């Protein structure tokens, strides 16, 4: 399955993301308005991927058009990137189970964790700037890349492209904040600590939201939603937790309802595991 | 030395009242009483912990640990 993400305008970009979501996921019964929902990725066999062709970096122009991302379908991870001009798939070391026919697969030494990518890139995501201009720069870096080990510029390019494709697919919040950079003003998107925290809590969020039944709030670690509009404004696609390993940290209880708020059980457990404070502090 | 940086795969309360965590495939114990709830809270929320110690072989002790969200 192949989809285009077209960066020409905010319209073309959001349309692209919405079409992907519609094809690969199904709305939650209880978090859906119109055709805008939190949706659960439909089950695919392990190893299944879809391709994303990057378009519209130069508005409405058929240039800068040789970059494709390979996305593992069940978890939306970028498995690597394809230079369609050289017919080469540069694949991260944690995706040797992703096989793409027809391309030359270059198996990289670099893994795709944000820890690794930020290190190699010498670029932290908190505060990282993304503009149309730096997406073009990212595209050029990825097209110039060769070899089995990511360089700094290739890693920076992957950080930016993953944010505006896969992470925006997951989070309507990131879609909404980044898309302003596509406008004629050409402003800069700066990814916030809150954006980063969302991405880091995706698995936990995915385990909790299927249990939502209209509670006044949702609390998942550092993440809080106070109403359905906050949920819908923030989250668009979650893992299928029925199942995926990212759904579970420990224990087997997704949620606890406390005072009309749906808590991730592990969050409550993590502040209800303290003994008597006087005994704690004096028992050194 | 930075011995381990990862999620807590298990924790164990030991018979000598120290507390062990397994991080990145190696086991580390601490006698620091303050750390016991903190380490369990880390395990419960999937925090990334950074274990630092003068020796990093499995079975080494530690008193210094960083708690990260990311």
């Amino acid at each position: 399955r192949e989809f285009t993400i077209d960066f020409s305008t905010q319209q073309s970009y959001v349309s692209s993301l919405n079409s992907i979501r519609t094809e690969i996921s199904t709305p939650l019964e209880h978090i859906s308005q119109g055709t805008t929902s939190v949706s659960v990725i439909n089950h695919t066999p392990p190893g299944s991927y879809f391709a994303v062709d990057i378009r519209g970096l130069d508005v409405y122009q058929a240039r800068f058009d040789h970059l494709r991302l390979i996305i593992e379908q069940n978890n939306l991870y970028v498995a690597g990137f394809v230079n369609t001009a050289t017919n080469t798939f540069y694949r991260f070391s944690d995706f040797t189970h992703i096989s793409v026919p027809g391309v030359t697969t270059v198996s990289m030494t670099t893994d795709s964790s944000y820890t690794t990518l930020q290190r190699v890139a010498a670029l932290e995501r908190s505060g990282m700037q993304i503009s149309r201009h730096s997406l073009v720069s990212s595209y050029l870096a990825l097209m110039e890349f060769s070899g089995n080990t990511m360089t700094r510029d290739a890693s920076r390019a992957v950080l930016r492209f993953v944010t505006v494709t896969a992470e925006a697919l997951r989070f309507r919040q990131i879609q909404r904040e980044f898309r302003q950079a596509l406008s004629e003003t050409a402003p800069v998107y700066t990814m916030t600590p809150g954006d980063v925290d969302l991405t880091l809590n995706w698995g936990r969020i995915s385990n909790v939201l299927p249990e939502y039944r209209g509670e006044d709030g949702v609390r998942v670690g550092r993440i809080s939603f106070n109403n359905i509009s906050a949920i819908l404004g923030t989250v668009a696609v979650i893992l299928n937790c029925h199942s995926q390993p990212e759904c579970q940290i420990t224990g087997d209880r997704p949620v606890i309802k406390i005072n009309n708020t749906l808590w991730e059980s592990n969050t409550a457990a993590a502040f209800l595991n303290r003994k008597s404070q006087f005994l704690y502090t004096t028992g050194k | 030395a930075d011995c381990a940086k990862g999620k807590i795969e298990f924790s164990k309360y030991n018979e000598d009242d120290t507390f062990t965590v397994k991080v990145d495939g190696k086991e580390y114990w601490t006698s620091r009483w303050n750390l016991q709830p903190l380490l369990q809270s880390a395990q419960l929320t999937g925090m990334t912990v950074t274990i630092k110690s003068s020796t990093c072989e499995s079975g080494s002790g530690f008193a210094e640990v960083q708690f990260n969200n990311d």
């Binding site: 978890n75 991870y77 795709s112 964790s113 944000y114 820890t115 990518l117 880091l200 | 999620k7 990311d70």
Partner: peptide, 5 residues
């Protein structure tokens, strides 16, 4: 496992 991109 730490978050993968």
């Amino acid at each position: 496992r730490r978050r993968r991109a």
